[PDB]
């Protein structure tokens, strides 16, 4: 009847406006606060921009197609709606690829990449995704009818003419969804696996606020760490403590020797004793009452935390969060787009087997991805939370 039609129009109109105010909030929070305009978050802006176009155009023009069961906007409006709903949506998956390649390189190649992540290169990548998404889709959706010599799409319906054949449709699905998904899947489990992945050389890097040095500076950094270890083994006061310490805590001791020298650390007689006796809690409290904790409270708090827990938990906070954000993003994308692309896979090997009802549901399911991504920002990043509160 029409009782369900009104109910459908209400729900579709709900998620549409939630998408708009959910993404226009991210854009405003990006414009005002200049502290959220980083490299990774600059890519999230492209997602918000794309999802905004979806929430205000795509999700509203596809609602009408279900209610009226016909397309009453014209042939020009049909081809433009499809161009909009595809170019912006294809750029939305290119961003996820860039975001995934942005994090994987920061983990696999930390020496010659992290120091190259500028706002310029991050602004160019976004431009290339919007342009390439336009070139691959817009001339195909708009101009294909003229190349053929007629319009296949009958009056009262709306679909892409060059994707009329399920075989062509399937191949597009592989290159535009199945391939990007498998790539991001491989990357994610290499980023999540290589989280710790945490040696002394990068431990000092974080504490110094240090940066990636040249190839020669890494050989010099090794020669300095090895010498720092040898100096500890020579030190009659440090050697019995170092030998009793485990690999993670050994590095923390080397952190102090790098900073204060062998003799400097040797003065921590009571704390070094508590370390060898493995009284971590008491050693943490004692080390937190020295000059060292007041001269450099940040570097000390992490080294002391390392002593207390025996883990790298004080040097992985931001990188773990980076993966948890990407996790929520890829999970929201691979769950809302998979059913449609599965149906593209199925429809390739049979005729009348997938009802138009499921095609509309599978199509609308991809739309809610534009609604979840803004929530994923405030569900992980605590900086997006405070910004939305100010707005």
Ligand X SMILES: C[N+]1(C)[C@@H]2C[C@@H](OC(=O)C(O)(c3cccs3)c3cccs3)C[C@H]1[C@@H]1O[C@@H]12
Contacting residues toward ligand X, per CB under 6 A: 85-86, 89-90, 93, 163, 169, 172-173, 176-177, 337, 340-341, 344, 363, 366
Helices 40-53 and 369-378: crossing angle in degrees, nearest 10, is 150
Least distance (Å) between residue 89 CB and ligand X? 4
Q: Indicate the residue among 340 and 384 with the shorter CB distance to ligand X.
A: 340
Q: Indicate the residue among 65 and 377 with the shorter CB distance to ligand X.
A: 65
Count of Cβ atoms closer than 10 Å to residue 331 Cβ: 13
Least distance (Å) between residue 23 CB and ligand X? 16
Q: Indicate the residue among 236 and 350 with the shorter CB distance to ligand X.
A: 350
Least distance (Å) between residue 344 CB and ligand X? 6
Least distance (Å) between residue 64 CB and ligand X? 15
Compute the distance between CA of residue 94 and CA of residue 386 in angstroms, rounded to an integer.
28
Q: Indicate the residue among 92 and 286 with the shorter CB distance to ligand X.
A: 92
Least distance (Å) between residue 308 CB and ligand X? 49
Compute the distance between CA of residue 100 and CA of residue 128 in angstroms, rounded to an integer.
16
Q: Indicate the residue among 53 and 326 with the shorter CB distance to ligand X.
A: 53
Question: What is the C-alpha R_g of the chain?
Answer: 28
Our CA angle for 370, 324, 343, nearest 5°, is 45
Q: Indicate the residue among 264 and 355 with the shorter CB distance to ligand X.
A: 355
Least distance (Å) between residue 329 CB and ligand X? 16
Least distance (Å) between residue 4 CB and ligand X? 22
Tell me which long-range contacts 139-145 makes (C-beta under 8 A, separation of at least 24). 141/79, 141/82, 141/83, 141/86, 142/79, 142/80, 142/83, 145/79
Question: What region, left, alpha or beta, does residue 179 occupy, with left being phi > 0 and alpha being psi -120 to 50 degrees?
Answer: alpha
Compute the distance between CA of residue 348 and CA of residue 353 in angstroms, rounded to an integer.
10
Q: Indicate the residue among 316 and 368 with the shorter CB distance to ligand X.
A: 368
Name residues whose C-beta falls within 8 Å of residue 247's C-beta, 6 or more positions apart in sequence.
none
Contact 384, 378 (CB under 8 A): yes
Q: Indicate the residue among 173 and 241 with the shorter CB distance to ligand X.
A: 173
Compute the distance between CA of residue 305 and CA of residue 51 in angstroms, rounded to an integer.
41
Our CA angle for 50, 53, 54, nearest 5°, is 90
Contact 7, 355 (CB under 8 A): no
Least distance (Å) between residue 110 CB and ligand X? 32
Least distance (Å) between residue 90 CB and ligand X? 4
Q: Indicate the residue among 242 and 364 with the shorter CB distance to ligand X.
A: 364
Our CA angle for 250, 255, 260, nearest 5°, is 125
Our CA angle for 54, 55, 57, nearest 5°, is 65
């Amino acid at each position: 009847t029409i009782w369900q039609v009104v109910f459908i129009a209400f729900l579709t109109g709900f998620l549409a406006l939630v998408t708009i105010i959910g993404n226009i909030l991210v854009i405003v929070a990006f414009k005002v606060n200049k502290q959220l305009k980083t490299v990774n978050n600059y890519f999230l802006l492209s997602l918000a921009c794309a999802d905004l176009i979806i929430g205000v155009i795509s999700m509203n023009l596809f609602t009408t197609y279900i209610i009226m069961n016909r397309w009453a906007l014209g042939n020009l409006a049909c081809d433009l709606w499809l161009s909009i709903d595809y170019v912006a949506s294809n750029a939305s998956v290119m961003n996820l690829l860039v975001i995934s390649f942005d994090r994987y390189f920061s983990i696999t190649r930390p020496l010659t990449y992290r120091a190259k992540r500028t706002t310029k290169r991050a602004g160019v990548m976004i431009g290339l995704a919007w342009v390439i998404s336009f070139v691959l889709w817009a001339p195909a959706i708009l101009f294909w009818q003229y190349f053929v010599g007629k319009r296949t799409v009958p009056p009262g319906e709306c679909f892409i003419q060059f994707l009329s054949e399920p075989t062509i449709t399937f191949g597009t699905a592989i290159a535009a969804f199945y391939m990007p998904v498998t790539i991001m899947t491989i990357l994610y489990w290499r980023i999540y696996k290589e989280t710790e992945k945490m040696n002394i050389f990068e431990m000092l890097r974080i504490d110094e606020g240090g940066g990636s040095g040249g190839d020669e500076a890494e050989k010099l950094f090794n020669q300095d760490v090895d010498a720092a270890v040898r100096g500890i083994l020579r030190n009659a006061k440090l050697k019995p403590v170092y030998d009793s310490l485990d690999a993670v805590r050994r590095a923390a001791l080397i952190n102090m020797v790098f900073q204060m020298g062998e003799t400097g650390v040797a003065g921590f007689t009571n704390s070094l004793r508590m370390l060898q006796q493995k009284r971590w809690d008491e050693a943490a409290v004692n080390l937190a009452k020295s000059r060292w904790y007041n001269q450099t409270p940040n570097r000390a708090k992490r080294v002391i935390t390392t002593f207390r827990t025996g883990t790298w938990d004080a040097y992985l906070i931001k990188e773990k969060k980076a993966a948890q954000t990407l996790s929520a993003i890829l999970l929201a994308f691979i769950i809302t787009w998979t059913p449609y692309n599965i149906m593209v896979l199925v429809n390739t090997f049979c005729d009348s087997c997938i009802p138009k009802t499921y095609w509309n549901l599978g199509y609308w399911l991809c739309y809610i991805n534009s609604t979840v991504n803004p929530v994923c920002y405030a569900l992980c990043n605590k900086t997006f939370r405070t910004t939305f509160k100010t707005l």
